[PDB]
Design a protein around this ligand. Structure first.
Ligand SMILES: NC(=O)c1ccc[n+]([C@@H]2O[C@H](COP(=O)([O-])OP(=O)(O)OC[C@H]3O[C@@H](n4cnc5c(N)ncnc54)[C@H](O)[C@@H]3O)[C@@H](O)[C@H]2O)c1
Ligand code: NA
Ligand code: NA
Ligand code: NA
Ligand code: NA
Lengths: 499, 499, 499, 499
């Protein structure tokens, strides 16, 4: 359609999407089927590049793309991004439909993601708040007298952006945006599960003027991407995905600059003075949004004795009164999970919790190979820590509810999971809140709201098993830029007179 | 002596230095002999910890040290560091003698290093220029209206500091200083080649009040240290050493925060308008200081046609008029190289250059198993790139001299090595200098001076094979600290009236 | 026309422009004739407000405008500014024609100013690089332990923007932009000499959505404006104009936040190694642009012995080969000066220089009541300091040329004027340049270019008689914003455990 | 004694303190008697300088001191300040005794001030967090392409520090410290009421190595100081004192850089959820400390209906159980007010409140010409606004207590005074606190503590009648430093390739 007009190869009934090889759309490696979780049907195919095409693409990115991106002044890069935003925006419905179909995303969620992608592109100028360099006077030390330094940021070169299946459009646009804005060339490697949105975004950027040899989109399955991560021409790896793959990526990449957003779930804590209506609403939402397939989804709810009853009651009502089905209905609240495998795991995990003293408070019923009801499992503090739902991230709409004596116990249980992405705290007392802020070991804490990374207006990232470094408007500069120091020596040259 | 009074075990004629196990000096693993490069004699032994002692130490650092360091307010950490500086300073001669003996460092160089270590400790307060956090208003986006965020730094926890043999005292004090100042516990792992200075520095810090369970000094040989790097309780690895080991470290560590200073040599460029007296002096020095065993040692000299003759002549005179011998003589200029193996490599490399069209302009003579003359090898631009001296870092006092047509050719040859730590440029024209600053792919550029990292008053670090990230007063905060974001939600709470 | 359709009162043959009274266009004070310097003819009239209307307007700005501006979120303020930019841009020719007619600005200069105004409005988002606040941890002092502070910027309230005649459009848009972007209401008071462009800009902002009660445009002659400056409801005064008026403004205003851009001329220094073609061109331009009616116009040229001859020769050729006349001709280079009075002063000053040993090298001829030739007067170093052209700012296209022995003498003569706005330095030696940078007492130094403030991409402002504080994208935040500190006390509350 | 050994002229029974004239202690103007508020007796005399000595001193400061301060590298300035701290510290008792005697300060308060002065001097290195400059890339605008700028701070030159009577030692050391640390020369003008401590501090700095011609201490009565403020050689005026004098200072000084800390009192608000024990204690203290002669003293207490009774009861008990008398007794809590005149005003003001419906809840009794009891006057919200105690700052230990319906009314009453220095808020609800933070128009807000500027670890300053700009460690740099911009032009020079 319009955008991918001459790109998509209509062959054998299903549209065939090629990879973009830093100059031309193409590919001559195995073709791979892309399915919809809505009906397990094949909706398209993508052409992966061969080994020689990967090698040739990296060579173009390194030898030419680095310079095309860097030698395009920032004023023009910004124009490129603002124009790409316009193109995506006018093709909004088309972008959204693919998200609904390829990712099983409910209509309102698909529309929200496209819009986040557009805003991210349009606010590229706010990323400049952290682009200026430093001027360091030398007279504060005897050894540096009559000396001085300039510290400025420089693009690293080629950034490999590896994206997860759950934000197939936004994650790719976000990484491309902060990488390009600072002068880098970029290699995008989307989940082979739903690579269509990224293909569309990359086409819009190319139409907008993005230097043709400074970007690549390689539809490669997981382990074939290792080839890219391990290459010396790739100076940085921005990876968003699971902990286990993140580990593999670093061990394969070796010394390089990395940003690792490794998810895991998020705990929510409700203090006795919390507005329970606000909390119940925000928590229910954090649990089921996009069928819990959000890195920042609430997986554990801790509530102090006096509000626990009401709170868990309201959240249960809110969850069971939800409509599950095909994501196309603007009436549906929850669509399918990405694969039948994901549902299998959620069910096995719910059973595990029950066998260990847990009781289902809402949901619990599987509705098909990829459909399930958002579940809320109550569990006694003394047994919760051994439950699979606590010890692991079950990427589905399921959370545990645990009653706690006080803030200290809530903090301890929240910190007991191996992850540390975000945490949410509902309450009003400034002291209790300040204590929780200090002691919760996570990259971000949301006071009186559900965790929501949005477009990264506020930086976010993990602690512990949730990764390292941050993404965010401005802050992402640390991940795809290197400092360059220039020290000038004027010793005895008469600039200063002993100072 | 005084400092390590009850610590050193005088047994079997040679002093035996134990490891510090986050509470008590000890160790029950193999004992290892420490030799002096001055005479290849055994001057001490160090006790490495057993597997159980490594495990127990990490456990203490993680469970107790994190909190002892963090729960000691900054005002007190600063007092600890200022007191440790006083102790090292009054034991200056003793610290220097060990450097001379254990590292083969010339007296003036040993004294300089001790003093750099003292200054680094005393200037810990300048590290606070980058400790403050950010306050982000939320009204610049519609989605964040009536919201706002705080971004503050937090210690990561346990930092593993792995140090090289050539700055055995300073590197250990530098890493301990920037790690502790931000609230982290630290595990120090010095080169097993010359671990004595670090043992002494750690003792001075402990005497100064450094939280006893927040530091460890493990005398472990290279590959036994892997155990520490790979442990999940180690949240950061500050590594200074060679490229090849740096790579191994990351592949073993996996996802973690890293600073990798991987050295390599540095090229020096002399423009036609350069003060040749200043240049000849600075370049000779950059070539031979500490027998070229400096990451920032000059390994390649590029000089434009019109000054090449004079320049290389003066540098040759300066180099051959140097006195080599035992580092104790305040008269000696160059002491021994750390091992006979290192000299073997320098000789093999000089031969390689000769066989490939190179001509020795100064030095070239080996004077013993660990002694050699600082060598200056001239080479034609058309053959230099294939020489071992160009393609690799030969950690010894040896550099190549290459005549070039112009700045473009100089820049191209400087960038042809696989490293990118620093570069030096001598000249006066602002345009040529600005061009070189932009195009030299290195972490730092020194205008009209030899590259010298000093105490990191100006940040430094590598590009390409020279590593990632920076160290420096203030800038090191990015390597041992993680951001924590706190987002407050006041939507509809009446703080703002639509804004 | 289009923009000021229902605003302009076509009465008595000449268009009558009313003042904008924070809600409605109007005015009932004396009417004042506005003339064109091109033909001394009346081209319009402006209605000044009466004393009661000034009082009522300030009251509206204080009681309502402060809140309308502040309570409009930044995301919307930005939209208002981007839309105002679009409106000005599509009315470009109309804006330019008024500049040509009302200010006597050459066509290319008028177009440049309109465009600068449009860019300034569109880049309002870059002003956010300095809008974030600070988060100060309290453990670095014993007295502040268990305490912490937040420092954030807040609008001051009502900013009075007083503008000069020479950048009638840009200065007004610049001040309105940085004042509004941070949440302030604004009172604009343009030169009564050429207030038409400001009236048009304010109308475009109002059409774009600028909160109607948060802005005012008062066509008041100089001393009647004092009433506004002295009012307690005006929290800040952004004044661009002459030194003498600036002084009066502060003495009338009393304690308030001020930015004073008080001009004066600028000296240019040419080192012996300078590209004389670049220098001669840039200097000629700095001397005659807009008939020298630029605060940053070059009024003194200092050139080292060896290049002096050539340099002054080339600049003289360039100046006398200029075409003076009506600014409408896209062929004319120099239009008229703002008033016959200004020309009188330039002639008297040129005579003074001649009587004191000076010799005219180019120009010197008056061509009419408001027209003159750009003049270049040579003068011996030993007598220049007593010349009116040196001691004062003669706001016309006239500069002195003085030969100097060396950089020290050039710096001394440049610093001998009572002003210190900018200075220009042409040359290539990094040491000489660095010395001049340190010792020239001015707000800004331009290396190898003529001084040009542009839209303030780089901050600018004066030293000495040239004023205080800076304007510039981002930096202007200090002039119309106040810090607010919030200190939180958690002493003994268990957040920290002695830290 | 020791410090002022050869300086003090013991003549006619009373010690005679000379002024310091930027080189030598001396003075030949009228002698002025200095009295103690403890017994109204003459305890010393100070020699004011004649008109010629003021003129000569300014000339030395301008021509020589600017350069002596600036040409002393920062590393040395820091040493000077650390040594001055040591000297003051070992003369602690002597410094304290003079404060007790000359200012009537209770012993514990006098000791606290000396210590604050010592800490301020020792933490001068923390002021460097805001000393670095900026490096601005030019490719973000088409007009600035191939251009770039450096922005760095520069000392303004001579700073005139005018200090109030209530912090005679600290204010002088604070201003001297932040002025000198950035490279400025300083003229100190203390209250002629208690100039002894400043004389002692200046002597300690001179003994510590402070450039002899870069500092001056002029014992001049109020209006004779105008001569200094109005001089063009004084580039900045740091003034701490009353509103009315501050206004005079600016009107006399004209265009200059100013910091005006103009005091006024501070309101305290107690929310219904506040810890009343903490609040009652902190508020009582804020009311009586140094007999209310603190710019940040609490002058108005607003308490919500439900806690008002208890709160005002506890504060009343705490206030009447205080011991008034000679400040020497380490038992006394409140010493005398600075002059009988000050007590007269407090009594007249208390009467005014009573006549207007107010009722005394504690104190109210005058105990002598300079002694009074700290008074707490209750007042109905409907009549408080017309009371002298509300409308003005009565510099004495007296505050009003007003019961309020809710936070909105508290905020409105707090904002009704003409001042806006600080405010205090006691409570725990994050929303109410956030609202108060936004709407209280003051320079600083203290949550759950009494307002205390301390040594300026957190910046402080006023809004409204309380002045402009801030003082504080780091932030004071904006008041005594000017930016200098250097723009480099490389257009067409081949540094960048269109970028
Ligand atoms: N805002 C703050 O941070 C702060 C701090 C401490 C004190 N204060 C305020 O200062 C006042 C108490 O001090 P004070 O009574 O000595 O007040 P003040 O205003 O009389 O002090 C003025 C200082 O300025 C000098 N001075 C007086 N007239 C002058 C003139 N015409 N020209 C130049 N200099 C002149 C005085 O000798 C004295 O040194 C109170 O109002 C208090 O709130 C404010
Ligand atoms: Na690698
Ligand atoms: Na790992
Ligand atoms: Na005033
Ligand atoms: Na003045």
């Amino acid at each position: 359609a319009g955008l991918l007009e001459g790109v998509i190869k209509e062959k054998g009934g299903v549209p065939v999407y090629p990879s973009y090889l830093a100059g031309e759309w193409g590919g001559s490696g195995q073709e791979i089927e892309v399915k919809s979780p809505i009906d397990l049907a094949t909706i398209a195919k993508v052409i992966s590049p061969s080994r020689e095409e990967v090698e040739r693409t990296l060579d173009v990115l390194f030898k030419r793309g680095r310079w095309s991106a860097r030698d395009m002044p920032g004023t023009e890069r910004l124009a490129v991004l603002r124009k790409a935003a316009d193109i995506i925006e006018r093709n909004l419905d088309v972008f959204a439909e693919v998200l609904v179909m390829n990712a099983g995303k409910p209509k309102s969620a698909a529309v929200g993601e496209v819009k986040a992608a557009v805003d991210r592109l349009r606010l590229a100028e706010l990323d400049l708040k952290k682009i200026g360099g430093d001027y360091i006077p030398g007279d504060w030390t005897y050894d540096t007298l009559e000396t001085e330094g300039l510290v400025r940021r420089e693009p690293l070169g080629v950034v490999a952006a590896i994206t997860p299946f759950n934000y197939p459009l936004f994650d790719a646009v976000n990484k491309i945006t902060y990488s390009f804005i600072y002068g880098n060339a970029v290699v995008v490697k989307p989940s082979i599960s739903d690579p269509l949105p990224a293909a569309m975004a990359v086409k819009a950027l190319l139409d907008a003027g993005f230097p043709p040899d400074a970007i690549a989109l390689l539809n490669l399955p997981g382990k074939e991407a290792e080839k890219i991560v391990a290459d010396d021409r790739v100076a940085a790896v921005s990876f968003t995905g699971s902990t286990e793959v993140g580990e593999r990526v670093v061990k394969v990449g070796g010394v390089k600059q990395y940003v690792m957003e490794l998810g895991g779930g998020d705990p929510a804590i409700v203090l006795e003075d919390a507005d329970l209506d606000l909390a119940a609403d925000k928590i229910a939402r954090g649990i089921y949004s996009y069928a819990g397939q959000r890195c920042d989804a609430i997986k554990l709810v801790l509530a102090e004795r006096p509000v626990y009853g009401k709170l868990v009651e309201e959240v249960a009502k809110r969850l069971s009164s939800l409509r599950v089905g095909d994501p196309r209905d603007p009436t549906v609240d929850v669509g399918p999970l990405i694969s039948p495998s994901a549902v299998d795991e959620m069910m096995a995990a719910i059973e595990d919790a029950v066998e260990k003293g847990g009781r289902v408070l809402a949901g619990g019923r599987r509705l098909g190979p990829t459909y399930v009801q958002p579940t809320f499992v109550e569990a006694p503090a003394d047994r919760v820590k051994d439950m699979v739902l606590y010890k692991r991230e079950v990427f589905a709409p399921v959370a545990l509810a645990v009653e706690v004596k006080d803030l200290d116990q809530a903090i301890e249980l929240a910190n007991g999971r191996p992850y540390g992405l975000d945490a949410a705290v509902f309450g009003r007392d400034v002291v209790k809140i300040r204590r929780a802020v200090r002691l919760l070991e996570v990259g971000a804490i949301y006071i009186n709201d559900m965790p929501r990374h949005g477009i990264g207006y506020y930086p976010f990232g993990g602690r512990k098993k949730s990764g390292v470094f941050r993404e965010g408007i401005g802050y992402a500069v640390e991940a795809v830029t290197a400092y360059k120091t220039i020290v000038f020596n004027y010793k005895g040259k008469g600039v200063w007179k002993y100072e």
